[PDB]
Design a protein around this ligand. Structure first.
Ligand SMILES: *[C@@H]1O[C@H](CO)[C@@H](O)[C@H](O)[C@H]1NC(C)=O
Lengths: 48, 96, 150, 48
């Protein structure tokens, strides 16, 4: 500080800048038919 | 693990079994540099990380916002600074 | 056939368990992202909470929200300085009867050889007034001595 | 030898799946801790 004053760079002109941001609030609702995935329609697999 | 050392280090066992820790993309030295830059950003002009005012002034204005009159703050400035660096030392000495 | 089907069932059930665990983790992440998105709607779009880099980096002015696939898109509008001027400033003055004054969201500068106030984010000298000054009954040391002010 | 190796593969693959699930949980914790640390930087260090 020279004589009680500091050197500072103060803006003399400005613009407005845009910045997009994506926040994920949802996801595909995946549903699985567990018996049909594992065994399809085969009776011996369903029994096991 | 290949330097000819005599110690069977468990990390050498892990790595030769496929379990290896890779270094982070930024070294902790770079993060240390970032933190030091963020620290000196508050103690010198333009005080880009201290609301644009000297660090001691920021401390004084922060204490004033808690209900402490400015008279004692600018009267006991050196005592406040000593208390601050003593708190920093106690934080430092707490790691021992 | 029963032992072969049992081997297939075990493999398929382990795969489904792994998928379910990964789905639980991903949905926890989605829940907390949605909580963050609701906070941004409340505190950037509908109001401007006094948090510095919550609504995008920089001097945040205001934010808007639009619908996006499986989420929200936020438009964060910021004050971006274009050109700068190096100016000698003072963070406080000891005026009149040793009364201390600090600039309010700005700096004290010497324009036309007398003390004036300028905002911190735009160089524009202004007369010093109680609107842009925080008063102190005793001036801090190293404050610039200005007995001729007010 | 193939059935014995299959038993070893299954045990090792289950241990690997358990470790990767625990690692996903721990990394979620790390992400949210880092978000908290970023909040603390922005709202305690760089401002109040
Ligand atoms: C600010 O910058 C814009 C674009 O760079 C320019 O058109 C305008 O004249 C400038 N204004 C001042 C006061 O410098």
């Amino acid at each position: 500080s020279v004589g009680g004053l500091y050197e500072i760079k103060i803006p003399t002109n400005f613009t407005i800048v845009g910045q997009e941001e994506f926040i994920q609030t949802n996801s595909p609702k995946v549903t699985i038919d567990c018996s049909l995935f594992v065994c399809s329609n085969y009776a011996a697999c369903h029994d096991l | 693990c290949t330097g000819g050392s005599e110690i069977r280090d468990l990390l050498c066992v892990q790595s030769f079994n496929g379990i290896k820790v890779l270094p982070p993309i930024l070294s902790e030295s770079q993060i240390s540099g970032y933190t030091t830059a963020a620290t000196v950003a508050a103690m010198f002009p333009p005080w880009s990380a201290a609301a644009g005012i000297p660090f001691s002034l920021n401390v004084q204005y922060r204490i004033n916002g808690l209900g402490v009159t400015m008279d004692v703050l600018n009267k006991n400035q050196k005592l406040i600074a000593t208390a601050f660096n003593n708190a920093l030392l106690s934080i430092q000495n707490g790691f021992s | 056939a029963q032992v072969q089907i049992d081997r297939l069932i075990n493999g398929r059930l382990t795969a489904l368990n792994a998928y379910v665990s990964q789905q639980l983790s991903d949905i926890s992440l989605v829940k907390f992202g949605a909580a963050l998105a609701m906070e941004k709607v409340n505190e950037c779009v509908k109001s401007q909470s006094p948090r510095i880099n919550f609504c995008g980096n920089g001097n945040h002015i205001l934010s808007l929200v639009q619908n996006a696939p499986y989420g929200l898109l936020f438009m964060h509008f910021s004050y971006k300085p274009i050109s700068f001027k190096t100016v000698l400033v003072s963070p406080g003055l000891c005026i009149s009867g040793d009364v201390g004054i600090a600039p309010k969201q700005g700096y004290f500068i010497k324009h036309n050889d007398h003390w004036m106030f300028t905002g911190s984010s735009y160089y524009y000298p202004e007369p010093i007034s109680d609107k842009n000054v925080v008063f102190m009954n005793t001036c801090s040391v190293n404050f610039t001595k200005a007995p001729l002010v007010y």
